[PDB]
Amino acid sequence: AIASEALSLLSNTYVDGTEIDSSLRIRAIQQMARNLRTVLDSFERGTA
Amino acid sequence: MPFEIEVLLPGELSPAETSALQKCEGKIITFSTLRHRASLVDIALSSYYINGAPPDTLSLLEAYRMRFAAVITRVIPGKLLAHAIGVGTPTPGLFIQNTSPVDLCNGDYICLLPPVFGSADSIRLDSVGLEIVFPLTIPQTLMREIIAKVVARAVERTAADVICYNGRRYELETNLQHRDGDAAIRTLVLNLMFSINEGCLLLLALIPTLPIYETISSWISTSSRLGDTLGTRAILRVCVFDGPSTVHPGDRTAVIQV
Amino acid sequence: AMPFEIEVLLPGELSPAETSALQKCEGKIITFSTLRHRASLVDIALSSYYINGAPPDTLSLLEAYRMRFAAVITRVIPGKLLAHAIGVGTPTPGLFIQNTSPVDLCNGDYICLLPPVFGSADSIRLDSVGLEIVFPLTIPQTLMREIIAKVVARAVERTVICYNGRRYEAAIRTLVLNLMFSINEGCLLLLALIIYETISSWISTSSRLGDTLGTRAILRVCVFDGPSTVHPGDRTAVIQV
Amino acid sequence: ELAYVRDGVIQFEVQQPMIARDGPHPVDQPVHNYMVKRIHKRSLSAAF
Amino acid sequence: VNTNCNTLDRLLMEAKAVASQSSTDTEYQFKRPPGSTEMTQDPCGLFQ
């Protein structure tokens, strides 16, 4: 799942040329990607 | 030399209960023995126990006289501290607060009495489970009125509670009695005798009008230490420099050690 | 660890002999209502005591003298008065005393005070302002009871004091209205034991009168390079506590 | 971005002046005040 | 212990360094003085 008021940021991007590019992107993108790859490696694992 | 006591706290209790007791800054406790290294169970209510049995209001009084009083001032964010007040002479005057609803004046004689007005702010604990009790700070003058009328029912206990002050009337409570509180009555069954000698029959030879000197000296010393054991003895003295002249309940004050 | 000071306010244009009497008056013990660095004169005069129309009798004047703060007067600038405040733990001064009592004193004994019952012989009568400044006595705490009980044992019948080797010899008439029956009540309560509001008086009133007539000493004498006996009217060193 | 946020306590400190009096005595100066404050979010929309 | 419903395993948490249960000096077995510090080991009152 993805939580509301945080699923809303990745449901669409209305930003254009953000000034502070590091404040609220990596704590969202990395935090969600460490999960988006756990679900993928889950298929790599459940075969065993 | 202010003999310092260090009572550092185990960490099992979450950081909330340190800010829940930080409303208890500058309050007194009574140590059984004295040493610069101690623990937290040393002054929890379970340490004031007797026989493994819950003490009463009376067997809690004779506990104070033996155990030393000290003034805590500051909760170090890691440990605790106390200024041993009974014997040594701390040059910087220790701050206390008056948890008892009774107004103070500049120059009072405060003593230690277990709570009677109805409720206090003793704190419990959920990890280690230590119940630390507090005493109250009160003037000697009204305390001598309290102990009389508590023993007034203590002598009814082995035979067969409202006081006025400040325009106020505060009740007191009395636990279940112990058949040995004997000793709590043996404070005056020995004292009433040492008040009368051959010079006290003439004190009846002049009654309808309102070898004698020895009864006019011997009785005087008796009268000071009739309640010194029957109660306790003021350990401090109050004085303020340029604050408001009246100390209210629930607030700090400035005292000095006798 | 610094000392306390009290500064007394003095009026102006006083006669040049009473203002000299304050040059004759140094070393006595003065009792203070509250410790304040800005202090007037009248506050340590007899008029700022427990007056209910009359100067306070010793029956409660002793209670005041014990409840009130203490001090020792020292050298006086022609302008203002300097006196050291004692009773808090003021550290290690060169503190002396002037004994104001008809009794004698030796070296190595505790000194306390008591309210005068004898006279008003050494106090200052400032007839210009109409205000009286009074002072207590200084007796050893070996005689605190042997000075009090001995004069009132005489005062019970109507209704020689020895120390160091000098064979020497109103405010009391109110005090005996609370003591004659203070022991007759023990006599009665011996029969009353062998009611809940009968023990309500005696234990509390006896204890109100007991702590106060078993007093403790606040000064003790000391001399390093000097005599070993101080007579009434000297200036010799002591130590607080 | 006041959207990907839950709460904040922006607490500040003030002074407590002490009028320097005459000859000393123990007063034991106060330490700080340190009041803490809560944050509350409102919002408003339109219709067109 | 009032937390009987908040745990799913604690036996391995509660059996390391329990305090002493009796005096270690007396000619007899007296009780534990409240000024004790000895962490004796007890497998006995563990499972009863």
Side-chain angles (χ1 to χ4, degrees), chain B residues 109 144-145 148 152-153 161 195 206 213 217 219-220 224 233 237 256, chain C residues 66 87-88 145 150 159 180 182-183 196 204 206-207 210-211 213 216:
Chain B
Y109 285 68
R144 292 310 191 266
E145 329 298 333
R153 185 68 71 89
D161 309 67
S195 57
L206 204 54
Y213 173 77
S217 170
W219 177 95
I220 295 282
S224 165
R233 186 64 204 205
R237 194 165 69 185
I256 308 149
Chain C
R66 203 65 56 191
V88 173
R145 187 176 50 249
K150 281 210 171 287
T159 174
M180 177 153 184
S182 159
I183 307 94
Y196 191 39
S204 280
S206 199
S207 182
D211 303 289
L213 257 52
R216 300 172 307 289

PDB file of all heavy atoms in Angstrom, chain B residues 109 144-145 148 152-153 161 195 206 213 217 219-220 224 233 237 256, chain C residues 66 87-88 145 150 159 180 182-183 196 204 206-207 210-211 213 216:
ATOM      1  N   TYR B 109       8.882  28.175  61.916  1.00  0.00           N
ATOM      2  CA  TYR B 109       9.599  27.006  62.427  1.00  0.00           C
ATOM      3  C   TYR B 109       8.961  25.762  61.816  1.00  0.00           C
ATOM      4  O   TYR B 109       8.029  25.191  62.388  1.00  0.00           O
ATOM      5  CB  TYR B 109       9.557  26.968  63.955  1.00  0.00           C
ATOM      6  CG  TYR B 109      10.487  27.971  64.606  1.00  0.00           C
ATOM      7  CD1 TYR B 109      10.244  29.335  64.513  1.00  0.00           C
ATOM      8  CD2 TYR B 109      11.617  27.554  65.300  1.00  0.00           C
ATOM      9  CE1 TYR B 109      11.091  30.254  65.096  1.00  0.00           C
ATOM     10  CE2 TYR B 109      12.468  28.470  65.886  1.00  0.00           C
ATOM     11  CZ  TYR B 109      12.201  29.820  65.779  1.00  0.00           C
ATOM     12  OH  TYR B 109      13.042  30.738  66.358  1.00  0.00           O
ATOM     13  N   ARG B 144       1.776  21.184  66.961  1.00  0.00           N
ATOM     14  CA  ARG B 144       1.556  20.784  68.348  1.00  0.00           C
ATOM     15  C   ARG B 144       0.073  20.690  68.684  1.00  0.00           C
ATOM     16  O   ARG B 144      -0.301  19.919  69.575  1.00  0.00           O
ATOM     17  CB  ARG B 144       2.267  21.746  69.298  1.00  0.00           C
ATOM     18  CG  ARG B 144       3.783  21.644  69.207  1.00  0.00           C
ATOM     19  CD  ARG B 144       4.220  20.193  69.306  1.00  0.00           C
ATOM     20  NE  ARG B 144       5.661  20.040  69.472  1.00  0.00           N
ATOM     21  CZ  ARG B 144       6.514  19.856  68.471  1.00  0.00           C
ATOM     22  NH1 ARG B 144       6.073  19.805  67.224  1.00  0.00           N
ATOM     23  NH2 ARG B 144       7.808  19.723  68.724  1.00  0.00           N
ATOM     24  N   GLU B 145      -0.778  21.451  67.996  1.00  0.00           N
ATOM     25  CA  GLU B 145      -2.216  21.267  68.128  1.00  0.00           C
ATOM     26  C   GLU B 145      -2.698  19.996  67.444  1.00  0.00           C
ATOM     27  O   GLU B 145      -3.683  19.398  67.893  1.00  0.00           O
ATOM     28  CB  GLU B 145      -2.959  22.477  67.554  1.00  0.00           C
ATOM     29  CG  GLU B 145      -2.202  23.790  67.668  1.00  0.00           C
ATOM     30  CD  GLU B 145      -1.928  24.192  69.102  1.00  0.00           C
ATOM     31  OE1 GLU B 145      -2.705  23.796  69.990  1.00  0.00           O
ATOM     32  OE2 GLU B 145      -0.943  24.921  69.341  1.00  0.00           O
ATOM     33  N   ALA B 148      -1.599  16.566  69.602  1.00  0.00           N
ATOM     34  CA  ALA B 148      -2.446  16.412  70.779  1.00  0.00           C
ATOM     35  C   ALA B 148      -3.747  15.710  70.425  1.00  0.00           C
ATOM     36  O   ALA B 148      -4.089  14.679  71.009  1.00  0.00           O
ATOM     37  CB  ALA B 148      -2.726  17.778  71.410  1.00  0.00           C
ATOM     38  N   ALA B 152      -5.367  12.142  71.193  1.00  0.00           N
ATOM     39  CA  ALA B 152      -6.636  12.159  71.908  1.00  0.00           C
ATOM     40  C   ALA B 152      -7.539  11.005  71.489  1.00  0.00           C
ATOM     41  O   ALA B 152      -8.390  10.569  72.271  1.00  0.00           O
ATOM     42  CB  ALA B 152      -7.337  13.499  71.687  1.00  0.00           C
ATOM     43  N   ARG B 153      -7.383  10.506  70.260  1.00  0.00           N
ATOM     44  CA  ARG B 153      -8.081   9.286  69.871  1.00  0.00           C
ATOM     45  C   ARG B 153      -7.180   8.064  69.993  1.00  0.00           C
ATOM     46  O   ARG B 153      -7.677   6.948  70.192  1.00  0.00           O
ATOM     47  CB  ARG B 153      -8.623   9.413  68.444  1.00  0.00           C
ATOM     48  CG  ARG B 153      -9.471   8.232  67.993  1.00  0.00           C
ATOM     49  CD  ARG B 153     -10.782   8.152  68.761  1.00  0.00           C
ATOM     50  NE  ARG B 153     -11.708   9.216  68.386  1.00  0.00           N
ATOM     51  CZ  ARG B 153     -12.588   9.125  67.393  1.00  0.00           C
ATOM     52  NH1 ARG B 153     -12.665   8.012  66.679  1.00  0.00           N
ATOM     53  NH2 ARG B 153     -13.389  10.142  67.117  1.00  0.00           N
ATOM     54  N   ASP B 161     -11.387  15.391  64.885  1.00  0.00           N
ATOM     55  CA  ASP B 161     -10.208  15.426  64.028  1.00  0.00           C
ATOM     56  C   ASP B 161     -10.221  16.658  63.123  1.00  0.00           C
ATOM     57  O   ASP B 161      -9.697  16.623  62.013  1.00  0.00           O
ATOM     58  CB  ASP B 161     -10.126  14.153  63.188  1.00  0.00           C
ATOM     59  CG  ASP B 161     -10.249  12.890  64.023  1.00  0.00           C
ATOM     60  OD1 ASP B 161     -11.343  12.647  64.575  1.00  0.00           O
ATOM     61  OD2 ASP B 161      -9.259  12.139  64.128  1.00  0.00           O
ATOM     62  N   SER B 195       6.182  15.372  86.217  1.00  0.00           N
ATOM     63  CA  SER B 195       5.669  16.724  86.353  1.00  0.00           C
ATOM     64  C   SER B 195       5.197  17.052  87.761  1.00  0.00           C
ATOM     65  O   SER B 195       4.922  18.218  88.042  1.00  0.00           O
ATOM     66  CB  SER B 195       4.505  16.951  85.377  1.00  0.00           C
ATOM     67  OG  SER B 195       3.479  15.998  85.580  1.00  0.00           O
ATOM     68  N   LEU B 206      -3.772  26.202  96.748  1.00  0.00           N
ATOM     69  CA  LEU B 206      -4.174  27.548  96.364  1.00  0.00           C
ATOM     70  C   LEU B 206      -5.081  27.512  95.140  1.00  0.00           C
ATOM     71  O   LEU B 206      -5.009  28.373  94.262  1.00  0.00           O
ATOM     72  CB  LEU B 206      -2.951  28.425  96.111  1.00  0.00           C
ATOM     73  CG  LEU B 206      -3.069  29.945  96.249  1.00  0.00           C
ATOM     74  CD1 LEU B 206      -3.641  30.338  97.600  1.00  0.00           C
ATOM     75  CD2 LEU B 206      -1.705  30.585  96.038  1.00  0.00           C
ATOM     76  N   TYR B 213      10.186  25.259  94.443  1.00  0.00           N
ATOM     77  CA  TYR B 213      11.039  25.661  93.329  1.00  0.00           C
ATOM     78  C   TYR B 213      11.490  24.469  92.496  1.00  0.00           C
ATOM     79  O   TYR B 213      11.515  24.552  91.263  1.00  0.00           O
ATOM     80  CB  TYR B 213      12.266  26.416  93.839  1.00  0.00           C
ATOM     81  CG  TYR B 213      13.249  26.706  92.732  1.00  0.00           C
ATOM     82  CD1 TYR B 213      13.017  27.721  91.817  1.00  0.00           C
ATOM     83  CD2 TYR B 213      14.397  25.937  92.582  1.00  0.00           C
ATOM     84  CE1 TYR B 213      13.903  27.973  90.800  1.00  0.00           C
ATOM     85  CE2 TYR B 213      15.289  26.182  91.566  1.00  0.00           C
ATOM     86  CZ  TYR B 213      15.038  27.201  90.675  1.00  0.00           C
ATOM     87  OH  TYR B 213      15.928  27.449  89.655  1.00  0.00           O
ATOM     88  N   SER B 217      11.441  24.215  88.311  1.00  0.00           N
ATOM     89  CA  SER B 217      12.544  24.024  87.376  1.00  0.00           C
ATOM     90  C   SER B 217      12.425  22.685  86.654  1.00  0.00           C
ATOM     91  O   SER B 217      12.515  22.630  85.423  1.00  0.00           O
ATOM     92  CB  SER B 217      13.886  24.125  88.113  1.00  0.00           C
ATOM     93  OG  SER B 217      14.963  23.726  87.283  1.00  0.00           O
ATOM     94  N   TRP B 219       9.917  20.772  86.004  1.00  0.00           N
ATOM     95  CA  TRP B 219       8.826  20.656  85.044  1.00  0.00           C
ATOM     96  C   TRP B 219       9.145  21.372  83.739  1.00  0.00           C
ATOM     97  O   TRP B 219       8.693  20.940  82.672  1.00  0.00           O
ATOM     98  CB  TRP B 219       7.530  21.203  85.637  1.00  0.00           C
ATOM     99  CG  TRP B 219       6.387  21.171  84.664  1.00  0.00           C
ATOM    100  CD1 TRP B 219       5.439  20.198  84.541  1.00  0.00           C
ATOM    101  CD2 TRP B 219       6.080  22.155  83.666  1.00  0.00           C
ATOM    102  NE1 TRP B 219       4.564  20.513  83.532  1.00  0.00           N
ATOM    103  CE2 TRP B 219       4.936  21.709  82.979  1.00  0.00           C
ATOM    104  CE3 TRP B 219       6.664  23.365  83.289  1.00  0.00           C
ATOM    105  CZ2 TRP B 219       4.366  22.435  81.938  1.00  0.00           C
ATOM    106  CZ3 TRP B 219       6.095  24.081  82.259  1.00  0.00           C
ATOM    107  CH2 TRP B 219       4.959  23.619  81.596  1.00  0.00           C
ATOM    108  N   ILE B 220       9.914  22.461  83.803  1.00  0.00           N
ATOM    109  CA  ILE B 220      10.151  23.280  82.614  1.00  0.00           C
ATOM    110  C   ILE B 220      10.878  22.478  81.543  1.00  0.00           C
ATOM    111  O   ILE B 220      10.449  22.437  80.384  1.00  0.00           O
ATOM    112  CB  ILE B 220      10.922  24.556  82.995  1.00  0.00           C
ATOM    113  CG1 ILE B 220      10.073  25.435  83.915  1.00  0.00           C
ATOM    114  CG2 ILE B 220      11.336  25.311  81.752  1.00  0.00           C
ATOM    115  CD1 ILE B 220       9.001  26.244  83.202  1.00  0.00           C
ATOM    116  N   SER B 224       9.583  20.873  77.343  1.00  0.00           N
ATOM    117  CA  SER B 224      10.167  21.045  76.016  1.00  0.00           C
ATOM    118  C   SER B 224      10.261  19.716  75.281  1.00  0.00           C
ATOM    119  O   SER B 224       9.958  19.634  74.086  1.00  0.00           O
ATOM    120  CB  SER B 224      11.546  21.696  76.126  1.00  0.00           C
ATOM    121  OG  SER B 224      12.266  21.563  74.914  1.00  0.00           O
ATOM    122  N   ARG B 233      11.101  17.558  65.757  1.00  0.00           N
ATOM    123  CA  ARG B 233      11.712  18.849  66.049  1.00  0.00           C
ATOM    124  C   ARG B 233      12.010  19.597  64.759  1.00  0.00           C
ATOM    125  O   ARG B 233      12.610  19.046  63.833  1.00  0.00           O
ATOM    126  CB  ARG B 233      13.003  18.681  66.846  1.00  0.00           C
ATOM    127  CG  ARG B 233      13.607  19.992  67.289  1.00  0.00           C
ATOM    128  CD  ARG B 233      12.673  20.710  68.243  1.00  0.00           C
ATOM    129  NE  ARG B 233      12.901  22.150  68.265  1.00  0.00           N
ATOM    130  CZ  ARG B 233      12.604  22.933  69.295  1.00  0.00           C
ATOM    131  NH1 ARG B 233      12.066  22.410  70.390  1.00  0.00           N
ATOM    132  NH2 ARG B 233      12.840  24.235  69.231  1.00  0.00           N
ATOM    133  N   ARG B 237      14.327  27.008  59.330  1.00  0.00           N
ATOM    134  CA  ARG B 237      13.712  28.287  59.674  1.00  0.00           C
ATOM    135  C   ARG B 237      13.572  29.121  58.408  1.00  0.00           C
ATOM    136  O   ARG B 237      14.485  29.149  57.581  1.00  0.00           O
ATOM    137  CB  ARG B 237      14.534  29.047  60.726  1.00  0.00           C
ATOM    138  CG  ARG B 237      13.771  30.199  61.360  1.00  0.00           C
ATOM    139  CD  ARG B 237      14.436  30.705  62.629  1.00  0.00           C
ATOM    140  NE  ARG B 237      15.709  31.374  62.367  1.00  0.00           N
ATOM    141  CZ  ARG B 237      16.528  31.810  63.315  1.00  0.00           C
ATOM    142  NH1 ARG B 237      16.211  31.654  64.593  1.00  0.00           N
ATOM    143  NH2 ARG B 237      17.665  32.408  62.990  1.00  0.00           N
ATOM    144  N   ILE B 256      16.193  28.586  56.092  1.00  0.00           N
ATOM    145  CA  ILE B 256      17.548  28.483  56.623  1.00  0.00           C
ATOM    146  C   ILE B 256      17.582  27.335  57.622  1.00  0.00           C
ATOM    147  O   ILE B 256      16.579  27.040  58.280  1.00  0.00           O
ATOM    148  CB  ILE B 256      18.019  29.798  57.291  1.00  0.00           C
ATOM    149  CG1 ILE B 256      17.832  30.996  56.357  1.00  0.00           C
ATOM    150  CG2 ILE B 256      19.479  29.719  57.712  1.00  0.00           C
ATOM    151  CD1 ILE B 256      17.559  32.289  57.086  1.00  0.00           C
TER     152      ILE B 256
ATOM    153  N   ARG C  66      12.844  35.365  70.328  1.00  0.00           N
ATOM    154  CA  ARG C  66      13.284  34.121  69.713  1.00  0.00           C
ATOM    155  C   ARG C  66      12.864  34.015  68.255  1.00  0.00           C
ATOM    156  O   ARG C  66      13.624  33.491  67.433  1.00  0.00           O
ATOM    157  CB  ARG C  66      12.742  32.920  70.491  1.00  0.00           C
ATOM    158  CG  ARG C  66      13.552  31.653  70.294  1.00  0.00           C
ATOM    159  CD  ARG C  66      14.955  31.811  70.851  1.00  0.00           C
ATOM    160  NE  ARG C  66      14.934  32.201  72.259  1.00  0.00           N
ATOM    161  CZ  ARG C  66      16.001  32.611  72.936  1.00  0.00           C
ATOM    162  NH1 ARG C  66      17.179  32.696  72.337  1.00  0.00           N
ATOM    163  NH2 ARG C  66      15.883  32.941  74.215  1.00  0.00           N
ATOM    164  N   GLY C  87      22.388  35.140  62.627  1.00  0.00           N
ATOM    165  CA  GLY C  87      21.251  34.243  62.691  1.00  0.00           C
ATOM    166  C   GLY C  87      20.987  33.464  61.424  1.00  0.00           C
ATOM    167  O   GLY C  87      19.990  32.736  61.364  1.00  0.00           O
ATOM    168  N   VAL C  88      21.844  33.593  60.413  1.00  0.00           N
ATOM    169  CA  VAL C  88      21.676  32.881  59.157  1.00  0.00           C
ATOM    170  C   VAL C  88      22.808  31.893  58.895  1.00  0.00           C
ATOM    171  O   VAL C  88      22.572  30.848  58.275  1.00  0.00           O
ATOM    172  CB  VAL C  88      21.542  33.890  57.995  1.00  0.00           C
ATOM    173  CG1 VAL C  88      21.530  33.189  56.647  1.00  0.00           C
ATOM    174  CG2 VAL C  88      20.292  34.730  58.170  1.00  0.00           C
ATOM    175  N   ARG C 145      17.424  28.345  82.728  1.00  0.00           N
ATOM    176  CA  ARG C 145      16.356  27.928  83.625  1.00  0.00           C
ATOM    177  C   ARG C 145      16.564  28.422  85.051  1.00  0.00           C
ATOM    178  O   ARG C 145      15.584  28.767  85.722  1.00  0.00           O
ATOM    179  CB  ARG C 145      16.250  26.404  83.599  1.00  0.00           C
ATOM    180  CG  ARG C 145      15.087  25.796  84.352  1.00  0.00           C
ATOM    181  CD  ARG C 145      15.082  24.287  84.138  1.00  0.00           C
ATOM    182  NE  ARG C 145      16.401  23.703  84.386  1.00  0.00           N
ATOM    183  CZ  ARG C 145      17.182  23.191  83.438  1.00  0.00           C
ATOM    184  NH1 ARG C 145      16.772  23.193  82.179  1.00  0.00           N
ATOM    185  NH2 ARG C 145      18.369  22.690  83.748  1.00  0.00           N
ATOM    186  N   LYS C 150      13.813  31.000  89.047  1.00  0.00           N
ATOM    187  CA  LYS C 150      14.143  31.482  90.383  1.00  0.00           C
ATOM    188  C   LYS C 150      13.415  32.773  90.737  1.00  0.00           C
ATOM    189  O   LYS C 150      13.116  33.004  91.913  1.00  0.00           O
ATOM    190  CB  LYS C 150      15.652  31.678  90.517  1.00  0.00           C
ATOM    191  CG  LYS C 150      16.422  30.387  90.754  1.00  0.00           C
ATOM    192  CD  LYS C 150      17.692  30.617  91.563  1.00  0.00           C
ATOM    193  CE  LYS C 150      18.341  29.298  91.981  1.00  0.00           C
ATOM    194  NZ  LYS C 150      17.595  28.598  93.066  1.00  0.00           N
ATOM    195  N   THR C 159       0.878  35.657  95.074  1.00  0.00           N
ATOM    196  CA  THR C 159      -0.481  35.506  94.579  1.00  0.00           C
ATOM    197  C   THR C 159      -1.001  34.101  94.853  1.00  0.00           C
ATOM    198  O   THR C 159      -1.074  33.671  96.004  1.00  0.00           O
ATOM    199  CB  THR C 159      -0.561  35.791  93.074  1.00  0.00           C
ATOM    200  OG1 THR C 159      -1.880  35.494  92.597  1.00  0.00           O
ATOM    201  CG2 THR C 159       0.445  34.939  92.331  1.00  0.00           C
ATOM    202  N   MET C 180       0.302  28.239  86.586  1.00  0.00           N
ATOM    203  CA  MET C 180      -0.117  27.648  87.852  1.00  0.00           C
ATOM    204  C   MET C 180      -0.987  26.420  87.628  1.00  0.00           C
ATOM    205  O   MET C 180      -0.838  25.410  88.325  1.00  0.00           O
ATOM    206  CB  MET C 180      -0.866  28.677  88.703  1.00  0.00           C
ATOM    207  CG  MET C 180      -1.377  28.092  90.007  1.00  0.00           C
ATOM    208  SD  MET C 180      -1.559  29.275  91.351  1.00  0.00           S
ATOM    209  CE  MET C 180      -2.046  28.165  92.665  1.00  0.00           C
ATOM    210  N   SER C 182      -0.986  24.853  84.639  1.00  0.00           N
ATOM    211  CA  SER C 182      -0.324  24.010  83.650  1.00  0.00           C
ATOM    212  C   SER C 182       0.213  22.715  84.251  1.00  0.00           C
ATOM    213  O   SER C 182       0.428  21.740  83.522  1.00  0.00           O
ATOM    214  CB  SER C 182       0.816  24.777  82.979  1.00  0.00           C
ATOM    215  OG  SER C 182       1.742  23.887  82.392  1.00  0.00           O
ATOM    216  N   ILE C 183       0.448  22.687  85.561  1.00  0.00           N
ATOM    217  CA  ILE C 183       0.867  21.462  86.230  1.00  0.00           C
ATOM    218  C   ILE C 183      -0.265  20.885  87.083  1.00  0.00           C
ATOM    219  O   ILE C 183      -0.368  19.662  87.238  1.00  0.00           O
ATOM    220  CB  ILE C 183       2.135  21.713  87.070  1.00  0.00           C
ATOM    221  CG1 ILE C 183       3.241  22.358  86.223  1.00  0.00           C
ATOM    222  CG2 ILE C 183       2.655  20.414  87.673  1.00  0.00           C
ATOM    223  CD1 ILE C 183       3.292  23.875  86.291  1.00  0.00           C
ATOM    224  N   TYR C 196     -12.499  13.309  74.922  1.00  0.00           N
ATOM    225  CA  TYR C 196     -11.830  13.499  73.641  1.00  0.00           C
ATOM    226  C   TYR C 196     -11.354  14.933  73.435  1.00  0.00           C
ATOM    227  O   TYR C 196     -10.390  15.153  72.693  1.00  0.00           O
ATOM    228  CB  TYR C 196     -12.749  13.090  72.488  1.00  0.00           C
ATOM    229  CG  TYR C 196     -12.029  13.003  71.157  1.00  0.00           C
ATOM    230  CD1 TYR C 196     -10.738  12.494  71.080  1.00  0.00           C
ATOM    231  CD2 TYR C 196     -12.632  13.433  69.984  1.00  0.00           C
ATOM    232  CE1 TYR C 196     -10.074  12.414  69.879  1.00  0.00           C
ATOM    233  CE2 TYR C 196     -11.969  13.353  68.774  1.00  0.00           C
ATOM    234  CZ  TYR C 196     -10.690  12.844  68.732  1.00  0.00           C
ATOM    235  OH  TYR C 196     -10.012  12.755  67.540  1.00  0.00           O
ATOM    236  N   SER C 204      -1.174  20.456  74.081  1.00  0.00           N
ATOM    237  CA  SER C 204      -0.811  21.520  73.158  1.00  0.00           C
ATOM    238  C   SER C 204      -0.335  22.783  73.861  1.00  0.00           C
ATOM    239  O   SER C 204       0.617  23.417  73.399  1.00  0.00           O
ATOM    240  CB  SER C 204      -2.000  21.853  72.260  1.00  0.00           C
ATOM    241  OG  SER C 204      -2.114  20.909  71.213  1.00  0.00           O
ATOM    242  N   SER C 206       0.919  23.014  77.080  1.00  0.00           N
ATOM    243  CA  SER C 206       2.203  22.682  77.687  1.00  0.00           C
ATOM    244  C   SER C 206       3.318  22.714  76.655  1.00  0.00           C
ATOM    245  O   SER C 206       4.407  23.222  76.928  1.00  0.00           O
ATOM    246  CB  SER C 206       2.130  21.310  78.358  1.00  0.00           C
ATOM    247  OG  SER C 206       3.177  21.148  79.298  1.00  0.00           O
ATOM    248  N   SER C 207       3.066  22.196  75.451  1.00  0.00           N
ATOM    249  CA  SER C 207       4.092  22.200  74.419  1.00  0.00           C
ATOM    250  C   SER C 207       4.311  23.578  73.810  1.00  0.00           C
ATOM    251  O   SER C 207       5.426  23.870  73.364  1.00  0.00           O
ATOM    252  CB  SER C 207       3.745  21.200  73.315  1.00  0.00           C
ATOM    253  OG  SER C 207       4.761  21.161  72.332  1.00  0.00           O
ATOM    254  N   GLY C 210       6.597  24.919  76.347  1.00  0.00           N
ATOM    255  CA  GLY C 210       7.772  24.127  76.681  1.00  0.00           C
ATOM    256  C   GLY C 210       8.982  24.429  75.819  1.00  0.00           C
ATOM    257  O   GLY C 210      10.088  24.612  76.339  1.00  0.00           O
ATOM    258  N   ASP C 211       8.803  24.465  74.497  1.00  0.00           N
ATOM    259  CA  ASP C 211       9.924  24.764  73.611  1.00  0.00           C
ATOM    260  C   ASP C 211      10.528  26.126  73.925  1.00  0.00           C
ATOM    261  O   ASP C 211      11.725  26.349  73.712  1.00  0.00           O
ATOM    262  CB  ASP C 211       9.479  24.719  72.148  1.00  0.00           C
ATOM    263  CG  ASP C 211       8.866  23.394  71.764  1.00  0.00           C
ATOM    264  OD1 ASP C 211       9.612  22.399  71.662  1.00  0.00           O
ATOM    265  OD2 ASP C 211       7.637  23.350  71.550  1.00  0.00           O
ATOM    266  N   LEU C 213      10.670  27.917  76.908  1.00  0.00           N
ATOM    267  CA  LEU C 213      11.443  28.051  78.135  1.00  0.00           C
ATOM    268  C   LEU C 213      12.504  26.967  78.283  1.00  0.00           C
ATOM    269  O   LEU C 213      12.944  26.695  79.401  1.00  0.00           O
ATOM    270  CB  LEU C 213      10.521  28.063  79.354  1.00  0.00           C
ATOM    271  CG  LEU C 213      10.289  29.450  79.961  1.00  0.00           C
ATOM    272  CD1 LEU C 213       9.846  30.447  78.893  1.00  0.00           C
ATOM    273  CD2 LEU C 213       9.280  29.398  81.097  1.00  0.00           C
ATOM    274  N   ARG C 216      17.765  27.512  73.279  1.00  0.00           N
ATOM    275  CA  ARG C 216      19.086  27.106  72.826  1.00  0.00           C
ATOM    276  C   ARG C 216      19.955  28.343  72.632  1.00  0.00           C
ATOM    277  O   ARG C 216      19.458  29.467  72.515  1.00  0.00           O
ATOM    278  CB  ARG C 216      18.981  26.284  71.536  1.00  0.00           C
ATOM    279  CG  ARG C 216      18.159  25.012  71.707  1.00  0.00           C
ATOM    280  CD  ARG C 216      17.902  24.324  70.379  1.00  0.00           C
ATOM    281  NE  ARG C 216      17.316  25.235  69.400  1.00  0.00           N
ATOM    282  CZ  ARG C 216      16.073  25.697  69.451  1.00  0.00           C
ATOM    283  NH1 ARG C 216      15.269  25.344  70.442  1.00  0.00           N
ATOM    284  NH2 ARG C 216      15.634  26.520  68.509  1.00  0.00           N
TER     285      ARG C 216
END
